[PDB]
Amino acid sequence: GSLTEDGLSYKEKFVVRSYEVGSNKTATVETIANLLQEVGCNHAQSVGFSATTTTMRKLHLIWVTARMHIEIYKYPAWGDVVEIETWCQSEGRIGTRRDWILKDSVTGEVTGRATSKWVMMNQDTRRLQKVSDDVRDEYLVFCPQEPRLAFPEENNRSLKKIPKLEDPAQYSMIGLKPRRADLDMNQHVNNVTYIGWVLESIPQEIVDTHELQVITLDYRRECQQDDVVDSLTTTTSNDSQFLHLLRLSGDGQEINRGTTLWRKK
Amino acid sequence: GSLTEDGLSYKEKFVVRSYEVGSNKTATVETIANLLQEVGCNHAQSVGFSTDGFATTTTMRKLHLIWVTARMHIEIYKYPAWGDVVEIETWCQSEGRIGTRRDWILKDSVTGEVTGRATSKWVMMNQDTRRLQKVSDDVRDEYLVFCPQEPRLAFPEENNRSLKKIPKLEDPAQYSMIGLKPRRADLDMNQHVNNVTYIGWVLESIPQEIVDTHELQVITLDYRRECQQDDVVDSLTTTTSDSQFLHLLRLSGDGQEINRGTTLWRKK
Numbered sequence: 050g051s052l053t054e055d056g057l058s059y060k061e062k063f064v065v066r067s068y069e070v071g072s073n074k075t076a077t078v079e080t081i082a083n084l085l086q087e088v089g090c091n092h093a094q095s096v097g098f099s100a101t102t103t104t105m106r107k108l109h110l111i112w113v114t115a116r117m118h119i120e121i122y123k124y125p126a127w128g129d130v131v132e133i134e135t136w137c138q139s140e141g142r143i144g145t146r147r148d149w150i151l152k153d154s155v156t157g158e159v160t161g162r163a164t165s166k167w168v169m170m171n172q173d174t175r176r177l178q179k180v181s182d183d184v185r186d187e188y189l190v191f192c193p194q195e196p197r198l199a200f201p202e203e204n205n206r207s208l209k210k211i212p213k214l215e216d217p218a219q220y221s222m223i224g225l226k227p228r229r230a231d232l233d234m235n236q237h238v239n240n241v242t243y244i245g246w247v248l249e250s251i252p253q254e255i256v257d258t259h260e261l262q263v264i265t266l267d268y269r270r271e272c273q274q275d276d277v278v279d280s281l282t283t284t285t286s287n288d289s290q291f292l293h294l295l296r297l298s299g300d301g302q303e304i305n306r307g308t309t310l311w312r313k314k
Numbered sequence: 315g316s317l318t319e320d321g322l323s324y325k326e327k328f329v330v331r332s333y334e335v336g337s338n339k340t341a342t343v344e345t346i347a348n349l350l351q352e353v354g355c356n357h358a359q360s361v362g363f364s365t366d367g368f369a370t371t372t373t374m375r376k377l378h379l380i381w382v383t384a385r386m387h388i389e390i391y392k393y394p395a396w397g398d399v400v401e402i403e404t405w406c407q408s409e410g411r412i413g414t415r416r417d418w419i420l421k422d423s424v425t426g427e428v429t430g431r432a433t434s435k436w437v438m439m440n441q442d443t444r445r446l447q448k449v450s451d452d453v454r455d456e457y458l459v460f461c462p463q464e465p466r467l468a469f470p471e472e473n474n475r476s477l478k479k480i481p482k483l484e485d486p487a488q489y490s491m492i493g494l495k496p497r498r499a500d501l502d503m504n505q506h507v508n509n510v511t512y513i514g515w516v517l518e519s520i521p522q523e524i525v526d527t528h529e530l531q532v533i534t535l536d537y538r539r540e541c542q543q544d545d546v547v548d549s550l551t552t553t554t555s556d557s558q559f560l561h562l563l564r565l566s567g568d569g570q571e572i573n574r575g576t577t578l579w580r581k582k
């Protein structure tokens with residue numbers, strides 16, 4: 050991978066692997082989300098970051114994902130090459146946004162797009178806050194100055210408030226626990242694991258006959274290594290829509306909420 | 315990747331990704347086992363077994379047969395760091411008509427030093443009935459021409475760890491992780507639990523104090539029975555000793571053994 054000519058975006062090609070595909074021999078959405086994270090991390094490395102700035106490290110601040118929105122038009126097949134371009138944009142005092150564009154490396158067609166909202170958090174107190182002027186000045190030089198949105202519609206085609214699923218849920222997967230492979234290098238549960246846990250409660254008949262087109266996921270709290278999660282889903286709807294909720298079974302504390310849109314194959 | 319000069323082995327380079335590394339910023343053994351599967355699959359494609367099957371041959375597809383791991387043995391001397399390039403060479407060889415073996419050699423791409431070695435044994439399973447069967451003469455004849463004729467072993471030395479018989483762990487186990495269940499990401503393209511998931515499940519019962527102070531050097535894992543998508547697994551471990559452990563994976567519903575193995579850990 051490499052920064053683009055103007056140094057304001059980053060591109061990388063990936064060859065879809067045997068273990069990265071599902072039953073239809075195309076990449077799973079969790080493989081797509083892993084590749085989004087990888088190209089994002091390579092972009093941060095290319096501009097000198099490690100995603101904190103010098104001022105952020107001094108004040109004990111970290112970036113944390115508040116929302117993830119992914120839309121897939123075609124999933125790349127096993128052995129296909131997918132090219133991903135990523136960039137970051139300032140949202141003033143609110144936080145930052147990272148967008149992605151997936152393309153078929155052979156035809157150049159846009160096969161998918163994604164957007165994510167990031168907020169600042171004190172690493173000690175775990176409390177969110179607004180971005181100061183000094184933090185903003187350290188990374189604004191790495192962002193396009195004029196707006197560049199992956200989703201012109203509303204910077205995610207579901208900017209809407211995701212409501213909280215009401216008990217009883219229509220479907221569920223109870224007692225989900227992370228294993229050591231679900232942890233990142235900092236010993237925290239990888240953000241993509243939560244996508245897998247949401248999708249565990251979708252009925253098999255839908256998975257076998259439909260393809261996932263859209264996923265919007267809010268991140269509220271983290272699941273720790275010793276926590277246990279319940280995944281709850283209710284149909285809200287050729288197209289099938291679902292409302293999702295992830296909560297800790299120990300006390301019912303919400304960790305994530307989301308929505309999914311599926312299209313009949 | 316590409317076939318080697320004589321066309322009897324295959325090589326591929328991999329750049330270690332951010333999410334593929336553990337606490338010390340080096341590749342996990344589950345990432346290594348995933349790369350072993352990937353280079354094996356690319357070797358199958360390079361010799362004419364297309365992406366319409368999971369490295370199965372024409373006769374296998376016709377008879378509804380798939381590949382099944384019987385044993386996996388991996389030895390790591392140095393784990394590649396995040397962003398490092400590891401080169402893996404793989405080859406296949408029949409052991410008369412009793413075994414089908416796939417071996418691997420892992421190397422530092424720049425210096426050429428051997429950083430790891432692995433060996434595996436394979437049998438076939440009917441994808442519908444799930445009944446196992448040894449590799450048949452017709453299936454063998456389809457890939458024999460792509461295998462080295464003279465013996466070629468990742469572990470040629472006498473009394474090497476790869477040939478060790480593994481005993482069955484006695485109850486009570488010293489340590490355990492109970493109630494492990496696969497999720498959809500643990501399934502391969504044939505909707506079976508991926509062989510690497512069992513490696514993760516074995517290692518789940520290792521205590522944190524060992525993980526924090528030691529590095530995994532050797533893992534030998536026998537595969538006796540498959541864990542189905544609706545099964546629940548208990549992972550049991552006992553210290554046999556460097557630290558050595560004896561492992562057992564069994565279904566919690568009836569105690570049926572699915573795997574047994576051993577691990578060797580070196581102090582940091």
Ligand SMILES: Nc1cc(F)ccc1C(=O)O
Pocket residue numbers: 071076077078079080244245248249251256261498499
């Ligand atoms: N993890 C999943 C679960 C489903 F039910 C369907 C798709 C996926 C996926 O990761 O693509």
Ligand SMILES: Nc1cc(F)ccc1C(=O)O
Pocket residue numbers: 092093096098099100101102136137145188191192
């Ligand atoms: N804010 C950023 C913008 C970029 F383009 C790349 C990295 C960061 C970061 O904060 O790590």
Ligand SMILES: Nc1cc(F)ccc1C(=O)O
Pocket residue numbers: 229230336341342343344345513514517518520525530
């Ligand atoms: N999955 C693991 C669990 C452990 F306890 C130690 C190492 C690994 C690994 O995958 O390398």
Ligand SMILES: Nc1cc(F)ccc1C(=O)O
Pocket residue numbers: 357358361363369370371405406457460461
């Ligand atoms: N059995 C094999 C031997 C090779 F040399 C390469 C591929 C296979 C296979 O079964 O896919």
